[model samples]
Target chain A: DRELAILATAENLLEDRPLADISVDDLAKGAGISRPTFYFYFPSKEAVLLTLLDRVVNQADMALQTLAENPADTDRENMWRTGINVFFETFGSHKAVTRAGQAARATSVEVAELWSTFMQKWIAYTAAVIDAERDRGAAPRTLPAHELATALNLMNERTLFASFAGEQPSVPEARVLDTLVHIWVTSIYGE
Target chain B: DRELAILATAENLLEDRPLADISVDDLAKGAGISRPTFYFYFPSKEAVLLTLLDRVVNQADMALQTLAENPADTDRENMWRTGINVFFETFGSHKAVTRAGQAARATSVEVAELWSTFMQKWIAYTAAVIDAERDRGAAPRTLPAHELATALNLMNERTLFASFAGEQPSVPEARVLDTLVHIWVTSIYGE
Candidate 1:
C-alpha cells in the first residue's frame, strides 16, 4: 500500500533522531527518493505517522487472530505473558515504526487521534476481559480500564528512553515485558 | 547575578527550539560573547540545564518553607490543594526552564539524578502530610505515600502539557487543579 510505503520510509529516517529532529531532506535522503517524490506519497510528517499507526493496529489484529485460532489452554498468567511477549517483541521487531509513533505522538496533536484510536481498542480488548471477570465476580470493576491503558502508555514512554536507546546491556526481553505488565496489573487491580 | 544571566540566556535560546537544536555558538552569539567564554561558566548544554534545575529546586524549597511554617493545618485536602497550587504556579513561572529540564532529563541520567533529588524532596514533603493523616487515624497506612506522590507528579507532567499547549479551552486552571487533587485524594483514601 502507498500508506505502508510512506510509513516505512519515514520510520527509517526517524531511527536516528526524534520526529522533531527529522527534516524533509532527511526523510527524502533516507528514503532514497527526492523530496517531491516523498511528498507525493505523503502530505506531511504527520501523515506519515498516521500511516505507521495503521500498521501497528494491523499487526496487533493479526497477532490476536493467530492466538484465537490456535486456542491455547493457557491460564490467566500465561495469557498475560503471551500478550506482553507479543507486544514487546512487536516493539523490537518494528523499532523504527515504534520510535516514530512515540516521537510524533508526544508533541503533535495531529498524531494523537491515531494513538487514541489505537489505545481505545487496546484498552477495550483488556477491559473486555476485566468486564468478564467482574461479571464472574472474580475482579473489582473499580479501576477504569481505559485510564489504565493510558498509564501503561506513559510507562512505556518512560521505558523507551531507558531500555530502547541502543545503549546499555540489553535487558532480557521476557524480563522487561513481564516487569512492565506486572506493574500495570498490580497498579490497576491493587493486589 | 552571573547565574541569572546564564539562565536568562539559556531560557531565551531554549524556546526557539529543543535543547539539542541550540549550540554553544548560539548561546554565545545570543549573549554577545565568545563561544569559549560560554564554557568558562558551564561545562556543556547539560550544565546549562543543570543551572535551570537549580532555580526550580530553590523555588520549590521556598514553597516548602511556607508549608513547614504552618504545622497546625492538618487537613489533607487543604495541604494538597496548597501544594498543587504552589507546584503549578512554580512550574508556570519558569515553564521554559522546566521544559528544558525535562527534555534533557529523558536523554541524560546524570541530569535526571539532580532533577530526581528535588522530586524526592517534593514527594517526601507531600508524603509527610499523608503520614500525619494516618497518625491522626483519619487515613490508613496501607497506601504508600511515596508512590502516591509519584502519581501526582505524573499527573502534573501530563496536565502541564495540556495547560501549556491549550489542549482544552474549558480546562481552566481551576478544572485542572480540581482534577489533580481529586485523583490524589481518591486514589489514596478510597481504599
Candidate 2:
C-alpha cells in the first residue's frame, strides 16, 4: 500500500538523519507519491511516524511474548537473560524508528499510547515471571511483582535509549547489556 | 535584567503549553518585550528552552548532591532512597521545563548535550556510591560499579520522564518512586 510505502521510506530516511530533518516533501518523494497524495493518506509527518510506531511496538511485543512462552523447565535466570537479550536485539534492529518514536512520544498522544501499551505489555510479562518466582520462594517478596517488573523494564528502556543516542557516561554495548542482566538477575533472585 | 525576565517568562509559558505551541511573539508578549528585544537575548524559542533546561538541571544536580552529602554513618539504603526522593521531587517541580527540554533533545545538539551532561553527573554520583559499597563489601562485586550506576540512573531518568509525560504502565507517582528504590537497593545490596 502507498501508506506502507510512506512508512518504509520514512523509516529508511530516519536511519540516516533525525525525523525533524526530514520534510513531508522528502517522505512523499521517497514513497513515489506527490505531497497532496501524502496528505490524502496521512495528516502530517507525525501521523506517518505514529503509524510506524504502532507497527514497531507490536514487533517488540511479539519478541517479548516469545520469551514469555518458554517452558518452566528452563531456569528462570536463563529465561530472564534470554528475554533481555531478545529485547535488546530487537530494539537494536529498529533503533532508528524507535528513537524517533520516543522523541515524538512527549508531544503526540497517539504515539504516547502506542509506546505505553508496549511498556505495559513488557511490565506484565516481567510481573508474571516475578510472581511465579515468588510463589516458588525464589524471588524477593518485599516489592510487588508488577512494580519490580516496571522498574526493570524501564531500566532496560532507558539504558538502551541513552546508548543508542550516544549520550554521555558512555559504555560499550556489550557492557551495557551485561550490566542490565546483572541488575535484573540480582534484583529478582538476589544472586 | 530583561534577559532574566525573558527566560522566566518562557519557563512559565512552557508549563501550560508545549514549546512548539509557543511562538516568539508569545514569548515576547509574556516577557513584556518586543519581538526584536526577545531576539536580543535568545536566537529562537529553542535557545530559550536550552537556557531554562540548564537552570532546571542545575537545580536537580543541587538537589541530588544535597542527598549525597549525608554522613557516612547512615545506612546506604537509606541514603539511596533519600537521594532518589530528592531526585524525583526536584524533577517533579520542574516537569514542564524538563519535558520541553527532553522533547527538544532529539532535534537540537545543544539541548542533547545539555541533557547528557546532567545525566553524566547523575551517573557519576551514583557510580561513586556503588563503588564505595563494593569496597565496603556492601554491594555486589560482580557488575562493574560504573555500568551498574549508569543503568540504574537511566532507569530513574526514563521512568520519571514517562511518568511526568503521563505515559503508561501507569502506577501512582509514589509507587513509581518506591519501585525504583526497590530496584536500586536490591541491585546493589542484593537484599
Candidate 3:
C-alpha cells in the first residue's frame, strides 16, 4: 500500500514539477512514510519512477492488445484509427508520468531500456498489422513491415508529445490525433 | 570568451552527467571562473543550457535555410532527401548538447519555449516546401501544408532521437534516416 501511495504521490508531484525537482524526501513526505521506508521499498527516486512507468505501460496493454488482435475482425480504417486514438488516450491519461519518464531516459540507462521495451512492444504490434495487411495485398511491400512500424510508432510518440507538451495541448488534440492517424494509414495502406 | 568557455564546459559536463546533476559550482570550476562570475554571465545552469541550445540552433540554421530557399529550383525528391540529411548532420554533430537541451526542456519552461521556437521554425520551413510541391502538382492538397509539416517534423525529431539515444544507435543511421524520408515522401506525395 505504501508503494502505491508513493507512486501516486510521485505522479501528483510530477503534475506540479518535473521529476528531477522532486527529491526522495518529497516522495517520502507525500506518501506519509519515512525516507528510510521509501528506500525500503525502492532504492532511489528513479526506482520509484521505474515502477510507476511500468504501471502506466501495463494499463495501456489492453489498448495495444486491441491493435494486435485479429486485424481482419474489424474494419481496416476503424482499426487503424482506433489504434492511434488509443495510443493518444494512453499518453494523455498518463501525461505527467510519461513526460517524466521521457525526461528520465536521457540520464538513466535503466529508464531508457524500460522505455524502449514499451516502444518495442508497440512497434511489434504495429508491425503485425502491417504484415497482415501486406499479406492481404492492402499494404505496400516497398519496405519491411517492422521498419515501417518503427518509424510510424516513433512518429506517433513524438508528434503526440510535442503537440501536448504543455499543460494544455499545443495543437488541437483532434488535429494532432487525426494527423497521426492519417500518417499511419497512409504509410501502411498507401492510401 | 569567458561566457563561451562556460557554455562549452556545461556541454562537456552534460556528456557524462544529467543536467540536474551538474551544478553552477561545477560549471564555474570547469570554466576557471568564480561562481559569482559564472552568475554574472549566466544566472543559472538552465541559462547556460539556453545559451548552448541557442548556439546549437544557430549552427543548424544554415541547413534549415537551405531547405527553405527556392524549393522549385531543384528536383522534389533530391531536395527533400537532402533537407533531412542536413537535419541529421546537424543533430548528429551536437548529439550531447542536443540531448541535454531536450532533457532540460521538460524541467525548464524557458528551454521548452526555446526548443519549441526551433521546432516551429523547422515546421514553417517544411510547410513552405509542401506548399511549393502542391503548387507544382507533386504533393497532395488534402491536408493543410502546415499540419502535414508539423507531423513530419515531429516524426523526424522523434525517430532521430530514438535512433541516436544510446552509446550506439538503436537502428542503423542510414535505415532510420531513409525510413523517415520514406514516411515524409509518402505522406506528402503519396508515393
Candidate 4:
C-alpha cells in the first residue's frame, strides 16, 4: 500500500510538477511514510522514476492490446495503425512523466541505461514483428527489419514527446496520427 | 581567443569525459584560464556549452552545404538526400557535445530553451522547404508541410543521437542513411 501510494503520488505529482522539483521527501510524505522508508523502497527519487518508466512501457503494451482489438488480428495495416495510435495514446497519457523521463535520461546515468534498455527491448520486439510480416509475405523486406524498426520506434518515440510537450504548430490528433500511420504502413507494407 | 579556447575545451573535454564529471575548473584549466577568468567569460560551464552548440549547428550547415554540392540545388531527391545526410553528419560530427547538450537540456533551464529554440528554427526551415517542393509539384501534399517537417526533422535528430550514443544492433552508416533517405523520399515525395 505504501509503495503504491508513493508510485501513485509520483504519477499525480509529476502531472503538476516537474520531476526535479518533486523532492524525495515529497514522495515519502505523499505516501504517508518517512524519508528512510522511501529509501528502503527506492535508492533515490530517480530510482522511483525508473520503475515509473517501466510501468509506462508496460501500460503502453497493454493499452495497445486493447486498442488493437480482435478485428485487426490478421491485418497488417490495422496492426500498425492501432499499435502507433495506442503508442500516442498510452505514452502521452502520462505526458508529464514521459517528458521528465526523457529529460532525465540525458542527466541520470541510471535513467539513461534504463531508458536505453527499454528502447532496445522495444526495437527488438518491433524488429521481430517486422520479420514475421516479411516472412509471412505480409510486408516487404525493403530495409532490414531491425533497422527499420529502430527508426520507426524512435520516430514514434520522439513524435509522442514532441506532441505531448505541445511543440509548435500542433497538428490535430487525427491528422498527426494518420501521418504516422501512413509512414508506418507504407514503410513496412509498401505503397 | 578566450571564448574560442573555452569552446574548444568543452568540445574536447566532452569527448573524453561525461559533462557531469567535467568540472568548471577542468574547462577553465583546459582553456588555459583561471577559474575566475572562466567565470568572467562564461557565467557557467553550461554557458560555454550553449555557444559550442551554436557552433555545431553553424558547422553542420556549412558541412551540409559542401556535402550537398552545386548539382543538388535543383533536384528534390538530391536535396532531401543530402540534407538528411548533412543532418546526420553535422550533429554526429561532434557526437560528444551533441550528447552532452542533449543531456544538459534536461538539467539546465537555459539549455532547454536554447535547444528548443534551435529545433523550432530548424523545423521552420524544413517546413519552408517542404512547401517549396510541394508548390513546385516535386512532392505530393500528403501530411501538412509543418507536421511532416516536424516528424522528419525529429527523426533525423533522434537517429543521430541514438546512433552516436552507440545503442545496440548498430546499423552501419550507409544502411541506416539509406533507410532514412527512403523514408524521407517516400514520406514526402510519395511512391
lDDT of 4 by residue, A1-191 (tens): 78889998998898898887899999998999999989888888888888888788778767655653444664666777777777787776778778878878766887777777767776887788889888888777787888888898888777777778776534455566876876777678763
TM-scores for candidates 1 onward, in order:
0.57, 0.86, 0.81, 0.87
Write down the C-alpha DockQ for each prediction.
Answer: 0.09, 0.58, 0.42, 0.45
User: Can you rank all candidates by DockQ, best first?
Assistant: 2, 4, 3, 1
* True-structure Cα RMSD, model 1: 7.7
Specify the highest-lDDT model's number. 2
Instruction: Write down the lDDT of every candidate, Cα atoms only.
Output: 0.63, 0.81, 0.79, 0.77
lDDT of 1 at A121: 64
Candidate 2 lDDT over residue span A105-139, tens digit each: 76688887777777887789789878888898887
DockQ of 3: 0.42
Interface RMSD of each: 7.5, 2.4, 3.4, 2.8
Candidate with the greatest DockQ versus the true structure: 2
Which pairs clash in the backbone of model 4? none
Q: lDDT tens digits, residues B1-191, model 2? A: 88888888888998898888899999899889999989998899999899988887888788776656644466766777888887688778888887888778767999988888877778887888788878888776877777888888888887887777776775557687877877888788873
- Judged by TM-score relative to the true structure, which candidate is superior, 2 or 3? 2
- Candidate 4 displacement at residue A171 in angstroms: 5.0
Q: After superposition, how far is residue B109 of candidate 3 from its true place, in Å?
A: 3.4
Query: Comparing candidate 1 with candidate 2, which one achieves the higher DockQ?
Result: 2
Once superposed on the true structure, which residue ranges of model 3 sit more than 4 Å away at CA? A1-48, A70-72, A107-110, A167-170, B1-48, B70-73, B167-169
- Model 2 misses residue A122 by how many Å? 1.9
Residue lDDT tens for model 1, B7-48? 678888776777888787777776777778888888887788
